[PDB]
Symmetry: C3
Subunit: 223 residues, 3 copies
Amino acid sequence: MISILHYGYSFIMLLGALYFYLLSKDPKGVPASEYLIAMVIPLWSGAAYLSIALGQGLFQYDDTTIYYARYIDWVISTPLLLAALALTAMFGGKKNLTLLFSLVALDVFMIITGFVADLSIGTTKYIWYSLGVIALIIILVITFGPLRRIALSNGTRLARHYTRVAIYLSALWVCYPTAWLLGPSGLGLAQELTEVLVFIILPIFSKVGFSIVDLHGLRKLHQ
Amino acid sequence: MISILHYGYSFIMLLGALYFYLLSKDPKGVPASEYLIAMVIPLWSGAAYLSIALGQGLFQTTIYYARYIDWVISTPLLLAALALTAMFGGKKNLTLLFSLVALDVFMIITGFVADLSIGTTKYIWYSLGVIALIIILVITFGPLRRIALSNGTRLARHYTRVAIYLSALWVCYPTAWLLGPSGLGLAQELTEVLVFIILPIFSKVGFSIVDLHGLRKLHQ
Amino acid sequence: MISILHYGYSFIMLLGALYFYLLSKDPKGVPASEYLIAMVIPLWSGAAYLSIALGQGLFQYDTTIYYARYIDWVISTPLLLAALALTAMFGGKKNLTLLFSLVALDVFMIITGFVADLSIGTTKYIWYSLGVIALIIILVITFGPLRRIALSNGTRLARHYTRVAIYLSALWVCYPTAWLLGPSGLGLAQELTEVLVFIILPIFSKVGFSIVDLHGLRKLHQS
Ligand SMILES: CCCCCCCC/C=C\CCCCCCCC(=O)O
């Protein structure tokens, strides 16, 4: 079942990527860079999850299954999602690439702490987990603080769209470390199959859902 | 023999890099960035192949993993060089350039995974890499060539020449891969080793000689 | 002792990062990019050294390889070179080609060090030698074309650049010297001696350099 779920996921990612490509052909004032980002996220995630489906992107460690292909996915897909969110805030205004790369750095560090934590045991696991959560809190502070202020500097209509996609992505963000901690990688309260389903369903909303909401909202700003 | 061939290759890469550096000192209207790219490609490939020569960049089928360490850097830089040639004298399309870089890096990764794989799984990964290569070729002879044409007859003629040159070499790599020990195992290991010594001399040094000379000629 | 030394180091890195953050809040004409770089360097080094403290970022190869040092340097050292290059270019046009030339040389340098550490006999010293050649080219760029950019940006900037260039260059040569003398090379110096050198040096490079660099740039500010 776990294999089939991953095959299904990869197919949905492919469909998402194709939809964003078709959108890119009639771009409605959205720069090509934002369509490229929207396409790379699902294609990369799709490839990583295909490796799990084929039984390659996982291995046994501490008598538990480590789905290491998830970290290979997130270390690329999640910084790109934050870049998409940052470019939305900056839409129709001057870019702040310093703030964008601040978020990329925090996010890549966050995913790495997750991988190291998964490879760790006892207090060490929760030291790495904690550093990742601290990174996420700083990302959320940037998202609803200075990044939102950039969005507001680009007018009421843009800021309204940014706030919507910021809430959407932020809601999903907090789910990942919650599931991680509850599941076999952490406290082991939640069953492996439950965790597998969460990390199939959540990413459909993040890897495809977010960019549908994001691109449609930006496209609507076009006359 | 395999060790000696790799030492020889690394020396040719060094000579190529030095030639491009000398060219960079009298640049003839070609930006320093294009000389930097031309120098990094052979130096990186040279280092990777030196690791094979020293018997480090392989594990034993024999997987020459140092080839993938090479290509994951050298091949995106070659595509960047080709994209900047198309855009020479005009506005840059960095989105299209990074599209090619992304496709190419993915392509090399599928090759490494395919090499580590067995049976149907190997050819699934190989096929994804081939699909990436086809999209790269479509971009090269489609939208990227259209950018070249927008930059005048002389530039477009040069771009078309280097595009055919690189494209000819591109298709050879996955062909040799599939025929050799990593794939169907029809070609002998020594034959594959010689192909992946000779091809790269034309790609890592040959391409940039043709590319830089053609761009420099536009200064006159 | 080795574990405790690494814990202490990581805490100093955190303090350094916080100092740079506080400086960034009253930036005195220094772009946000230079504060971001100054903060990432110690935070990344801190995380890497924390992994050694926890007994994760090293392994036996008979001899101990502190591989987390290379994970540190492959990010921290190109960022230090970027900091130095942006100092030269302060108040003037950026040369990102020269900056990325230095990044490329430096990343190659650190990789040769890792491979050298994994190597034995003549092979070790071939890789070490290629790294030293990379370092010599970096020094030639630093005191040649990069210094000429600094000079083009006025007397006061050029004076500051020269000071931070000598500071970083002095530290640069110490690393491959300690490497060669210690267990990774000739094995003249004891493990504990090498460990202390690679605790003390980085405090001067990861925090010291940016204190001197940022203070010198901030001093150029009018008002
Ligand atoms: C965890 C390691 C990841 C580190 C990657 C990013 C490090 C930050 C380095 C440089 C920041 C680049 C800022 C670009 C400045 C452009 C001007 C602007 O728009 O602000």
